[PDB]
Nucleic acid binder design. Structure first.
Lengths: 473, 418, 102
DNA sequence: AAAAAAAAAAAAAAAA
RNA sequence: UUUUUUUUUUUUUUUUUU
């Protein structure tokens, strides 16, 4: 019989200063904050794939419905929600012949074939960006299914169709978004199955990716990504306090160079002069030797925190008065002593660790439904459990499928009151722009930092990468 | 003065369009009356609508769809709207709104065939712009636009039926509380007495080597059988410590530090748990890091403990519920248990293909909700029990660890309903 | 000045003799495109900073520094800001034109 | 060459 | 990779003892 506190569900801000708990419902009624007159769209791909893109764009022009509106809200149409024009007319189309894609795809070397496939698209994208009068906001990269099946790590090409670079990952998406970093071209990759899937069917005859009931949410997750990549601000936070920068570190492995070198990358969220939130990357990637260290050496830690503080000073004028450095791993004192030196006296450094490993699984006594989202079990003033995954009545179901797993949030360094730490992470789980969902299972800093790290470790020749997420997600 | 806009529609089919249009118009500053807007119903509503259409309605908007085209209530509202149109001598009163692609303009209702309809079939935004332009042209009564009105109506009417409510709820965890430990942790200096190139995992009671000290809760001579040399040991050489001091955190020294003294209690209880599972004669699957314990087909009466099934069938695959346990001492002295499902071809021999096991586990867990996880977990741990309230891990000839058979309970002040 | 000029641009513009040069009927009238003062992503160049580089004896060094000051901000906005801008208007003061030429 | 206590990379299915 | 969630595989490191 231990006490369990409940934190109020965060509310996100929409146009005209109106607040709404849900993102989908608030967006569908109030629209985004900024007036993005139109999305000039460029597409790459084959003729068979272009028709599908045109058909889907025409579909999302018209409203679409889910099976049950309460659990998944209906989609009123692209211009209905986003008050911005995005039509099938005016798309700049660039060709990728089937012979070109089949020439390179059927190669024995996965690294070589994936490098060739990325090169084929990137050459045409760069050539269109540099040598064409047409201006395109986002480059929707339609990739077929054969490239999807046979252009990732551990992909075995069947012996029957094998007809015939190693410094780059076999992952098409990671390498693709990595090599476009220098040109700053916002792009989004599309499976032909993610498009009008009803063509693609299995042996039973039903579509392999049957999305009959989830058409509306599919449109929500595609439209929101397209709007963000074009320079839109769908929603923001409202309860975040002034002077609070967050910053989120995550460590990823690099395979190309001897010693994994454990590249560490960061994403920084804070406030701006006024009322608009600024959620960018803080990317100075600081590589860390040793096979499994994941603790950052003092020089790189100092550089990281100095860059994070400077990106706040330059945009507000003075240093943050209190930051919450989140991370997936615990902080050794070696890092924290380095961090303390860089920061001035007024700043209050806080080091927080968030993890899902330990299996605490709350089962209610009766009912085929899980715990409420927002329930928190405070172990002590330094550690707590927060159920950021669970049931919320608004979406009619729990975000999880089985019983959910909470987040162990502990204040390793600094002082911080545990209630406020639990109050910001739950709110931080709301700024997921890659997908339009009611809530995210983990805070977006630890997620978008993971994404940018997964992109920045694909190319070893990267230098001074852009800090905007639209080039990454 | 007539300043309300009436939106007639087919109530159980056109919820989405009517909702969206009404929430848009109210935010735009236009008074809107509709049946889905008002929360609760009574016998009076059938009368109420009539007087509205005759006394407060300045414009009448008819949602045109394959459903609402031949709906009796919609037809009656259309009739009264047409007649109040006649009485007002205002021809631009009924403003149809066609939203169906399958309902062509040649199949509309007779009251609407001759009336121009705003096209919503292609773009709802274009239709709403046309509505706004037409309402501005006809000088329809309007207030200053204020989206807060739309937000408030959304809050009182729709996120309204599904809101936070305060009432106590009690939850069942997956943590088994440890009631008591043996009084003293024993550090015996076997040294040369125990051969160095020997493994302590086969010892009768759990025990871990540290320096030249065998650490265990067991008595000095419990390991005589596996180690015949231990008969001539002296019990004054032990470094017995009041384990409760370790749990409090009081004890620390050069001999041992409490953090690395807590680990010698975690491996110890883990080996005790696996030993107990061997005692209960439940077979095991090797995981990548841990080990899972599942039960045969037939050991339980009709393959179910209590009234709840634990081993079942799925086409040719016998599925078995299994648990994985691990002792944790940071939050409290507890044992955490996780649930798994493993499949066999004949009920005794595990299927060797990991991918098939994972896929079939996903297929089975597709339909396992809270009362399928908690119930099976509690049934398994009760089957694990030795009495009605607790069980014991064998820690020696006389030392036992008492762990409760019911999971830790917490108390929530906020809950919900289906 | 830029904001005022654009505000002038949406409205029709008239010259002395329309026979010689047709009157300008407004941006949204002839190009039927939205070009409004709303949505201008603004990056500031303080008077002190632009004055520090300008008053230099060497033409080449002052020119390179003046170009660097603008291009660094333009690159930073392009790669580290969520907004997408079709064109980058670079308003330069008149003293630079007077004293940044060969 | 072990252990527990913490780490991340990848593939598979299914529902949102 | 539109997603998200829940798992299943490995692999690996640190602290300590021999």
């Amino acid at each position: 019989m231990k006490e369990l506190i409940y934190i109020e569900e965060p509310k996100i801000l929409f146009a005209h200063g109106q607040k709404c708990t849900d993102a989908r419902d608030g967006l569908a009624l109030f629209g985004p904050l900024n007036n993005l007159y139109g999305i000039k769209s460029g597409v790459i791909g084959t003729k068979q794939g272009l028709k599908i893109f045109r058909d889907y764009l025409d579909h999302i022009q018209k409203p679409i419905y889910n099976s049950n509106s309460i659990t998944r809200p209906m989609f009123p149409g692209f211009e209905a929600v986003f008050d911005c024009k995005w039509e099938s007319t005016g798309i700049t189309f660039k060709e990728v012949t089937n012979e070109d894609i089949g020439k390179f795809l059927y190669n024995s070397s996965t690294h070589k074939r994936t490098y060739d496939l990325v090169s084929l698209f990137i050459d045409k994208i760069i050539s269109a960006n540099k040598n064409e009068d047409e201006n395109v906001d986002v480059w929707f990269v339609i990739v077929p299914d054969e490239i999807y099946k046979y252009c990732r790590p551990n992909s075995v090409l069947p012996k029957e169709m094998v007809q015939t670079t190693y410094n780059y990952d076999a992952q098409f998406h990671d390498q693709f978004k990595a090599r476009l970093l220098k040109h700053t071209i916002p792009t989004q990759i599309f499976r032909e199955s993610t498009l009008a899937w009803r063509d693609f069917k299995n042996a039973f005859g039903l579509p392999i990716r049957d999305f009959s009931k989830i058409e509306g949410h599919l449109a929500w997750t595609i439209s929101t990504a397209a709007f963000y990549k074009a320079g839109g601000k769908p929603w923001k936070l409202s309860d975040v306090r002034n002077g609070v920068c967050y910053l989120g570190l995550v460590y990823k492995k690099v395979e190309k160079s001897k010693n994994p070198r454990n590249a560490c990358c960061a994403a920084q969220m804070f406030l701006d002069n006024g009322d608009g939130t600024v959620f960018k990357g803080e990317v100075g990637p600081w590589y860390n030797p040793k096979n499994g260290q994941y603790h950052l050496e003092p020089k790189e830690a100092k550089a990281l925190l100095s860059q994070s503080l400077q990106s706040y000073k330059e945009q507000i004028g003075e240093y943050p008065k209190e930051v919450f450095i989140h991370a997936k791993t615990r902080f050794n004192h070696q890092e924290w002593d380095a961090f303390l030196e860089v920061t001035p006296k007024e700043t209050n450094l806080v080091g927080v660790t968030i993890s899902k490993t330990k299996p605490l699984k709350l089962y209610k006594t009766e009912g085929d439904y899980t715990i409420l989202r927002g329930n928190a079990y405070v172990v002590n003033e330094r550690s707590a459990f927060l159920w950021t995954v669970g049931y919320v009545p608004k979406i009619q179901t729990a975000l999880s499928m089985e019983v959910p797993n909470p987040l162990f949030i502990e204040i390793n360094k600094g002082e911080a009151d545990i209630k406020q730490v639990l109050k910001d992470i739950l709110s931080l789980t709301k700024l997921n722009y890659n997908a339009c969902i009611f809530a995210d299972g983990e805070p977006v800093t630890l997620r978008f930092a993971d994404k940018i790290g997964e992109i920045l470790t694909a190319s070893t020749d990267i230098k001074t990468p852009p800090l905007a997420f639209k080039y990454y997600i | 003065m007539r300043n309300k806009i009436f939106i007639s529609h087919a109530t159980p089919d056109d919820n989405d369009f009517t909702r969206w249009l009404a929430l848009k118009l109210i935010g735009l500053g236009y008074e809107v009356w509709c049946d889905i807007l008002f929360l609760d119903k009574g016998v009076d509503f059938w009368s109420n609508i009539e007087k509205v259409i005759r006394e407060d309605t300045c414009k009448f908007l008819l949602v045109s769809s394959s459903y609402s085209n031949q709906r009796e209530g919609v037809l009656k509202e259309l009739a009264v709207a047409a007649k109040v149109k006649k009485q007002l001598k205002d021809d631009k009163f009924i403003i149809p709104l066609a939203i169906d692609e399958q309902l062509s303009y040649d199949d509309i209702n007779i009251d609407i065939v001759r009336l121009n309809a705003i096209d919503f079939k292609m773009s709802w935004a274009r239709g709403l712009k046309d509505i706004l332009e037409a309402f501005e042209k006809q000088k329809v009564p309007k207030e200053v636009a204020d989206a807060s009105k739309s937000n408030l109506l959304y809050q009182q009417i729709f996120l309204h039926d599904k809101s936070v409510i305060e009432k106590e709820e009690i939850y069942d965890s997956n943590w088994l509380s440890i009631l008591s430990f043996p009084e003293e942790l024993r550090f015996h200096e076997y040294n040369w007495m125990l051969p160095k190139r020997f493994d302590v995992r086969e010892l009768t009671f759990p025990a871990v080597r540290y320096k030249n000290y065998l650490c265990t809760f067991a008595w000095a001579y419990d390991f005589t059988y596996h180690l015949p040399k231990t008969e001539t040991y002296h019990k004054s050489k032990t470094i017995r410590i009041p384990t409760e001091e370790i749990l409090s955190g009081s004890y620390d020294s050069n001999f041992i530090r409490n953090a690395e003294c807590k680990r010698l209690i975690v491996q110890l209880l883990n080996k005790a748990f696996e030993l107990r599972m061997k005692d209960k004669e439940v077979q095991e699957y090797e995981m990548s890091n841990k080990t899972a314990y599942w039960l045969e087909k037939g050991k339980l009466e009709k393959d179910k403990f209590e009234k709840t099934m634990l081993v079942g069938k799925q086409k040719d695959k016998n599925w078995h519920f299994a648990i994985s346990g691990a002792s944790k001492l940071y939050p409290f002295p507890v044992l955490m248990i996780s649930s798994h499902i493993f499949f066999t071809a004949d009920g005794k021999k595990l299927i060797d293909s990991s991918s098939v096991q994972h896929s079939s586990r996903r297929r089975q867990g597709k339909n396992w909700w809270n009362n399928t996880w908690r119930t099976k977990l509690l049934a398994f741990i009760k089957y694990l029990s030795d009495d009605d309230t607790s069980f014991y891990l064998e820690m020696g000839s006389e030392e036992k660890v008492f762990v409760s058979n019911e999971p830790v309970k917490f108390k929530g002040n906020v809950s919900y309903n289906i």
